[PDB]
Amino acid sequence: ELLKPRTLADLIRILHELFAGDEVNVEEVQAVLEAYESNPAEWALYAKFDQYRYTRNLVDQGNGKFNLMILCWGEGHGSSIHDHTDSHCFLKLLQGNLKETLFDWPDKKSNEMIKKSERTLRENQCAYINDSIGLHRVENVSHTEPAVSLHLYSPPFDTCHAFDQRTGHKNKVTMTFHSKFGIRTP
Numbered sequence: 001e002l003l004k005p006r007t008l009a010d011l012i013r014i015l016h017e018l019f020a021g022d023e024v025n026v027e028e029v030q031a032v033l034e035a036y037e038s039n040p041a042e043w044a045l046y047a048k049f050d051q052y053r054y055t056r057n058l059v060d061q062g063n064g065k066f067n068l069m070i071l072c073w074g075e076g077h078g079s080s081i082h083d084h085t086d087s088h089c090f091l092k093l094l095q096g097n098l099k100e101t102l103f104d105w106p107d108k109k110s111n112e113m114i115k116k117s118e119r120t121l122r123e124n125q126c127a128y129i130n131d132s133i134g135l136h137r138v139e140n141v142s143h144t145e146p147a148v149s150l151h152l153y154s155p156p157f158d159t160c161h162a163f164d165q166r167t168g169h170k171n172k173v174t175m176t177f178h179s180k181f182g183i184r185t186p
């Protein structure tokens with residue numbers, strides 16, 4: 001029984017119930033994420049920006065079944081083209097807008113990675129990706145508005161690949177947390 005999360009804390013409680021088992025019902029998780037109405041006071045603690053690039057701020061470690069984190073995107077900040085390491089990845093906008101660009105897995109031949117589609121993720125919308133859907137890049141293309149997103153990855157992963165758009169070549173990146181539980185972790 002999926003009820004509307006009343007608050008971020010309530011959402012987290014619900015997520016622990018939805019991830020109690022071994023499998024993930026993606027549509028239900030996505031629906032619950034979407035139904036949480038972003039309330040900036042509830043996540044201000046986690047929304048720690050860096051001037052030069054987006055930051056990843058751990059909110060909840062789940063049952064070890066998932067990482068829940070908040071990403072803070074300054075104007076013009078964006079990600080690499082990346083995969084998600086055999087995990088589910090949900091992305092819900094808490095503030096602002098992000099452009100998500102989808103790419104196919106490259107062939108072995110060095111070739112330009114051509115976008116296969118793009119879309120604009122708007123406040124409160126929840127997107128979903130996994131390796132079977134493809135790779136993506138996420139960008140805050142705004143010149144005037146920071147964006148903040150809530151990401152849930154299951155299982156948790158701390159490495160992924162970045163892909164060079166000119167060639168499809170990939171390199172392994174270790175992801176770091178800017179903060180954990182509201183505490184800056186330099």
Ligand SMILES: [Fe+2]
Nearest residue numbers: 082084089136
């Ligand atoms: Fe991603």
